[PDB]
């Protein structure tokens, strides 16, 4: 009946927001990663790290506002407030991109907090911890994209900046530079994400159109009871429908719901792997057999060769402004350009 | 060829900056999340019907009258992971929610493609920010625009004889 | 010495076969191009 | 095309070996009942 058991008691009380031992890591960090983002997007510039404006105060809207990455000159510096780069000057810290690492690190520990939360609430309630497990897929995406990728690269400057349009810029970076659409790990991720949305809508509509008539009213929602032991739709009629429309259909309610867990969690895990390769510029950029034919045979053209021209346009036209620290200067006469445009 | 199509669409319509494509993403990320959430939550509350040496899936028999998970227990967990009232206790609202969210979002992204067919394009904030002298102060939108330009000037490199690609 | 009591049988049903084959065949068809390069 | 010659042995083994595995376990599942 000691102080630990007393504190456990108080943390684990049933209240509007459960707290738990995990709340101690989660809540400070989740609140700080979120305050960091709102703070920087409202007041903080990207002028000295990027040559960009990025706050409401500067005139950007919600689509263009962002907490941007530090200058490439910072390497992978932790940029601690109290560290050698900002030397405790909160103003200089902000201007060097110190809020990027703040958000990304407290965010990273908040995500751990949250997965432990799912572990803690599942143990205290007596369910199996498959929600926690499913959340491993968000974590792997986060760590691979925001941490591992720029760690393989020259600096944090090349991670995603935290902002709507800024993430758009990152999608186009990966097309032009990594040819990421060609990469069989992104494609499996794509199949996973869309596979999931498909499973989401198809399972929701099937339940809603094989409902049992359990009440008299035209609004069929009123006639479910959370404690009823009776299935609220006919698995049997739903099976016959999909068998006859599609050829196969589910017969097992457990396999169905496990498959709904499996598909999206797996696709995200596959894409994470693909980004890890990209950390090292280990791309699926080219087909060698294509390049040898095309070099030798100037009448040979495919959609593969077409898209690498488009990548070539992207790299040359965006590099100087998107990487100011390289002082690129491409005189007009060297920019790749099709006829007239 | 799919990838060729989606690159060229961005150079010509700024589809990423278009709200209807943003809702399609919201529909399609949200769908995958709710697919995993619903699948993990039902899977978390299976009632014990098997031993350690067998697929729990054998705990359900096709056409059984009883439900095969405890939704009260699932509500009880997800309610506490967030708060009680952000979680469903009625299965009909829950499954209609799963249906509606990705369907609606994909109506919009399909409408986005349908309406960018008449060249009502995504938001353009190229040079929207300037200083007191009148210098351009770039944002991330202008960076996007540079990438977009590199696409514009290269696509169908031989097929344009005049300065504007008007279709 | 007694025969080992920890042995169990293994099962793969027919749906799981179809699912497995589909998975391998689609995987083969996605990667085949990269193997040929 | 000037393509990777192990591509063929690679694809065949990629396909065959997991498949034979699944089949072996299926057929002996049916032989029980």
């Amino acid at each position: 009946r000691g102080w630990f058991d007393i504190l456990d008691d108080w943390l684990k009380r049933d209240r509007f927001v459960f707290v738990g031992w995990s709340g101690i890591l989660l809540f400070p960090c989740a609140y700080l990663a979120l305050g960091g983002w709102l703070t920087g997007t409202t007041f903080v510039t990207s002028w000295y790290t990027h040559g960009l404006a990025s706050s409401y105060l500067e005139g950007c809207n919600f689509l263009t506002v962002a907490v941007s990455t530090p200058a490439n000159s910072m390497g992978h510096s932790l940029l601690l407030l109290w560290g050698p780069e900002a030397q405790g000057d909160f103003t200089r810290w902000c201007q060097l991109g110190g809020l990027w690492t703040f958000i990304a690190l407290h965010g990273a520990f908040g995500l751990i907090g949250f997965m432990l939360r799912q572990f803690e609430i599942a143990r205290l309630v007596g369910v199996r911890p498959y929600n926690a497990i499913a959340f491993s897929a968000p974590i792997a995406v986060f760590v691979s994209v925001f941490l591992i990728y720029p760690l393989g690269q020259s600096s944090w400057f090349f991670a995603p900046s935290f902002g709507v349009a800024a993430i758009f810029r990152f999608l186009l970076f990966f097309q032009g530079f990594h040819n990421w659409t060609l990469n069989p790990f992104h494609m499996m991720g794509v199949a996973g994400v869309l596979g999931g949305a498909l499973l989401c809508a198809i399972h929701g509509a099937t339940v809603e159109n094989t409902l049992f008539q359990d009440g008299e009213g035209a609004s069929t929602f009123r006639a479910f009871n959370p404690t009823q032991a009776e299935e609220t739709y006919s698995m049997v009629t739903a099976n016959r429908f999909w068998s006859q429309i599609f050829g196969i259909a589910f017969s097992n309610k457990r396999w169905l719901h496990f498959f709904m867990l499996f598909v999206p969690v797996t696709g995200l895990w596959m894409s994470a792997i693909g980004v890890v390769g990209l950390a090292l510029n280990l791309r699926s950029y080219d087909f060698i057999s294509q390049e040898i034919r095309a070099a030798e045979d100037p009448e040979f053209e495919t959609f593969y060769t077409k898209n690498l021209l488009l990548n070539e346009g992207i790299r040359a036209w965006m590099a100087p402004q998107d990487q100011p620290h390289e002082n690129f200067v491409f005189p007009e006469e060297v920019l790749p350009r099709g006829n007239a445009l | 060829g799919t990838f060729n199509f989606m690159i060229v669409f961005q150079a010509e319509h700024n589809i990423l900056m278009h709200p209807f494509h943003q809702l399609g993403v919201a529909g399609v990320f949200g769908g995958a999340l709710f697919c995993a959430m619903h699948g993990s939550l039902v899977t978390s509350s299976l009632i014990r019907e098997t031993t350690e040496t067998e697929s729990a899936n054998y705990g359900y028999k096709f056409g059984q009258e009883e439900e095969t998970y405890n939704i009260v227990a699932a509500h009880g967990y997800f309610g506490r992971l967030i708060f009680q009232y952000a979680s469903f206790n009625n299965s009909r609202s829950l499954h209609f929610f799963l249906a509606a969210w990705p369907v609606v979002g994909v109506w919009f992204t399909a409408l986005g493609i349908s309406t960018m067919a008449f060249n009502l394009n995504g938001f353009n904030f190229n040079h929207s920010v300037i200083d007191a002298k009148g210098n351009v102060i770039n944002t991330w939108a202008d960076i996007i625009n540079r990438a977009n330009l590199g696409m514009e000037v290269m696509h169908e490199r031989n097929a344009h004889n005049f300065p504007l690609d008007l279709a | 010495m007694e025969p080992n009591p920890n042995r169990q049988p293994v099962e793969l049903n027919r749906t799981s076969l179809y699912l497995g084959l589909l998975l391998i065949l689609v995987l083969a068809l996605l990667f085949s191009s990269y193997f040929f390069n | 095309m000037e393509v990777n010659q192990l591509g063929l042995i690679a694809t065949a083994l990629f396909v065959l070996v997991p498949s034979v595995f699944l089949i072996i376990l299926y057929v002996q599942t049916e032989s029980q009942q």
Binding site: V236, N239, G247, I248, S251 | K61, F62, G63, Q64, E65 | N13, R14, T15, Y18, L21, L22, L25, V26, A28, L29, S32, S33, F36 | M1, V3, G7, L8, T11, V15
Partner: peptide
């Protein structure tokens, strides 16, 4: 031989389709 390999896999998937539908284990009630 690349062409042949691609078509053989595709062909096999179509035949698996065939067995998965007409030669499924049939679902049976209660």
């Amino acid at each position: 031989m690349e062409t042949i390999t691609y078509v053989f896999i595709f062909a096999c998937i179509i035949a698996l389709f065939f067995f998965a539908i007409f030669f499924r284990e049939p679902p049976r009630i209660t």
